[PDB]
């Protein structure tokens, strides 16, 4: 149960668009692309607007009553109710997006690569969360995005 509290320099995709007087089209959008690990044929189990917050708590939301925390919710037993976020922040002029595991009692992989609590590590378009060390515990895939055109 980390403490996680918004960096000085956070800010959302959709303010730092608007700053640069962007219209809709000309802009870089962000998803969380959710597919279910089991079969990946049917495409995409769900995808997730990224650009009005600056920050997303992904977390354990199984609809087997549970409190519902996470604003991303994956129903992934093995996950945390509060597992990692996804923060944006404006870097010096440079929109960057990070994901932080919140010392979660699984863990988080990034590309399959358990990744350590409570630090930010930068996010890739084509990066791939997995809300366990282990894959064998995974039923899902987070993968996110930016979008052109």
Same mark, same amino acid.
């Given at each position: 149960? +980390?403490?996680?509290?918004? $960096?000085?320099?956070?800010?959302? $995709?959709?303010?730092?668009?608007?700053?640069?007087? +962007?219209?809709? @089209?000309?802009?870089?959008?962000?998803?969380?692309?959710?597919?279910?690990?089991?079969?990946?044929?049917?495409?995409?189990?769900? @995808?997730?607007?990224?650009?009005?917050?600056?920050?997303?708590?992904?977390?354990?939301?199984?609809?087997?009553?549970?409190?519902?925390?996470?604003?991303?919710?994956? $129903?992934?037993?093995?996950?945390?109710?509060?597992?990692?976020?996804?923060?944006?922040?404006?870097? @010096?002029?440079?929109?960057?997006?990070?994901?932080?595991?919140?010392?979660?009692?699984?863990?988080?992989?990034?590309?399959?690569?358990?990744? $350590?609590?409570? @630090?930010?590590?930068?996010?890739?378009?084509?990066?791939? +969360?997995?809300?366990?060390?282990?894959?064998?515990?995974?039923?899902?895939?987070?993968?996110?995005?930016?979008?052109?055109?």
């Amino acid at each position: 149960a +980390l403490k996680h509290v918004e $960096p000085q320099d956070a800010i959302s $995709p959709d303010n730092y668009m608007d700053m640069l007087g +962007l219209e809709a @089209r000309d802009r870089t959008m962000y998803e969380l692309v959710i597919y279910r690990k089991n079969d990946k044929d049917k495409g995409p189990w769900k @995808r997730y607007d990224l650009n009005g917050r600056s920050c997303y708590l992904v977390g354990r939301e199984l609809g087997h009553t549970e409190i519902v925390v996470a604003d991303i919710g994956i $129903p992934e037993e093995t996950s945390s109710k509060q597992h990692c976020v996804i923060q944006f922040r404006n870097v @010096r002029g440079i929109l960057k997006c990070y994901v932080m595991d919140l010392d979660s009692s699984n863990g988080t992989c990034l590309n399959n690569v358990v990744i $350590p609590g409570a @630090r930010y590590i930068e996010l890739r378009s084509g990066d791939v +969360l997995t809300l366990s060390e282990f894959e064998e515990d995974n039923d899902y895939e987070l993968i996110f995005m930016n979008v052109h055109h």
